[PDB]
């Protein structure tokens, strides 16, 4: 996964923890600079 893809004028913040939660995670976010990491 990775941020800055669906739209530039709309940074992806929740989308991360969203697909993450459903993936069976505990959360996730655009860290580093433009990488949607996750975490259980």
Curated annotation (Swiss-Prot):
Induction: By injury to the larval cell wall. It is found in: Secreted. Disulfide bonds join 3-30, 16-36, 20-38. Hemocytes and fat body. Belongs to the invertebrate defensin family. Type 1 subfamily. Sapecins, which are potent bactericidal proteins, are produced in response to injury. Sapecin is cytotoxic to Gram-positive bacteria, and to a lesser extent against Gram-negative bacteria. This is Sapecin. It comes from Sarcophaga peregrina. The chain holds residues 55 to 94 of 94 of the full protein.
